[model samples]
Target: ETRECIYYNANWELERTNQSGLERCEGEQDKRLHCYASWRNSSGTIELVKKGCWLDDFNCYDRQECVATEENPQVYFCCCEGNFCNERFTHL
Candidate 1:
């Protein structure tokens, strides 16, 4: 399935409130257009990194946001399905 996704990168450019981009994975003609959002809080404050579409991820189907790795904690990453699903993120 294909869907509109939020596109932004805090490290490279400004976070886009006006989104007009999409990512096509192998769904209808592609399989998944999972939206992903990542950020960090190493400095004790939430900082969004990137927001955009991603490939198929069995773990991303859940509607919860989290920090996946303990070894390299402080960075929050999450994925979901929907138009602009990754437009928001949470450190917790």
Candidate 2:
């Protein structure tokens, strides 16, 4: 089966959001692919800043889960599997 994932970025507001798909994970053969969505609390508003395939070293280094930065507690992240799984933040 082809591994696909949704892609979105707040930086590129005009760009469409959809399953942009992804390439196979390089190295770490045991690592399972995943989709992720990240948000930052901007001026009291929780805004999504990043969403798409999870790339090792590029975006994430752990398994699917949620995290809040200690320095920036408002910033959060959520990750999952399956196509378009990162479209929304279910935990937060």
Candidate 3:
């Protein structure tokens, strides 16, 4: 099975997103935004298996974004938004 991962830009406060159990990306570009897909645990743990760029999507290069939802009402992606500049990894 495959899943999807959504990354947001927190007003250019940081860069990059973290996930787990990601399988692969779906597409490289979209009509208005760039999106990717991957598999992750329902515990809010997403594994980033693919990456892509959007057409004029908010490029968060050194900013922070908060992903608020009814389940994770206060979840935030500190450095989640920007172009993939280098090959890096994080602990999450």
Candidate 4:
């Protein structure tokens, strides 16, 4: 079954996946899809970069929380399975 994921990107102009709710992924059934999300904070101004279905990635297979690189901890990224699993994002 095709998986659904939240899709939004305030930085870019409105898009099909930018609806208020969730969106569906590609039609290719062989590929594994997961929900993905990203956000960043600059100068105390926080913003969501984007959110949607992601391709197969071992790092995102079981991961359910956002994580950013040590160089840019403020920038968070996360991916996981199940519908709307990417709804919530967190960072430290």
Residue 85, model 1, lDDT: 72
Better of 1 and 2 by TM-score: 1
- Per-model TM-score, in order, reads 0.64, 0.54, 0.24, 0.72
- Candidate 4 Cα misplacement greater than 4 A, ranges: 14-19, 43-45, 64-71
Q: Write the per-residue lDDT of candidate 4 for residues 1-92, one digit (tens) a residue.
A: 87888888765455543444678877566867778788777677768888888888776776655444345666677767777888886654
Cα lDDT tens digits for candidate 3, 1-92 = 22233433322234445432222334434323223222233465654433333332443333233221133323222222333321232323
lDDT of 3 at 90: 33
lDDT of 1 by residue, 1-92 (tens): 44677676665435434433544444546465677877776776777777777777886775544324434476677777766677666533
lDDT of each: 0.63, 0.56, 0.32, 0.71
Best by TM-score: 4
Find the candidate with the highest lDDT and give its number.
4
Model 2: per-residue Cα lDDT over 4-79, one tens digit each: 5655577664665442433333334666566677787768667877776665433434434434434555657775
Full ranking by TM-score: 4, 1, 2, 3
Cα RMSD of all models vs. native, in order, equals 4.4, 5.1, 12.6, 2.8
Error of 1 at 65 (Å): 6.8
> What would you estimate as the lDDT of candidate 4?
0.71
Error of 2 at 13 (Å): 7.5
